[PDB]
Amino acid sequence: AKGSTLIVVPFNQGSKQDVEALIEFIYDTEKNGGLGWDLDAIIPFAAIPEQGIELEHIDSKSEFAHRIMLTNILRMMGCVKKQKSARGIETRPAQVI
């Protein structure tokens, strides 16, 4: 619709450096090479499928999947809180679905 923009980026949610770089990108000013945005909502639906992996079979894939689906979701929230705090934003909270 009118006023709508879509930005597509490559992104491994499994990587800490990509999580920090992406939120830094969104929040950096256009001069510094960012979008100079300020998120109103985050919807972290990234997942990798795990079929047939019971307790005895938990290994590398599972520990990795767990990093995408919990640890880096907390890091992504953390980064948004650090960027908002840095620019002194106390009245525009980002809804996390």
Partner: protein, 179 residues
Amino acid sequence: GVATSFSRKKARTFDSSWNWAKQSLLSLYFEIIHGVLKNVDREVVSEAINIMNRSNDALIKFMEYHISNTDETKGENYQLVKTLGEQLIENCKQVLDVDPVYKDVAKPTGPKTAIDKNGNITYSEEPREKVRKLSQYVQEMALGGPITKESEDALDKDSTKEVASLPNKSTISKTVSST
């Protein structure tokens, strides 16, 4: 798995809706003339919603010119595109400064598993008999079921009439939370 993918340079921006509005209209205009989209299709109402959510003065002149220069005597499909188009132009003027709206008019489907004589398992999304609209979907969601018990539109008949109704904000007499 922890190998970086993100770089600022690979970011692809999409913001040229002013252009895409005019191509969306033209595609609709011709899909109706070539009788790919009929007056009974929900795909016509979905495209109207998407054209109205990109309404500006450029797009209105575009639609005016195309519809006003349609020769309706060239067949039924030309009369149809003219009738709809005239409506769609009126909707687009009433919403020129309104905010664009997420509004789905897709037919709510439900699951159907069939096993034939030979025993081939076929899954299909069939239409739900009671729910043919998202308003009805919310009613059905609000009523729940026995298990959860603890102790007028013109869709699928005349898409031009349903288009006419799009910019009208339906006032709610009594809310679905009371039911």
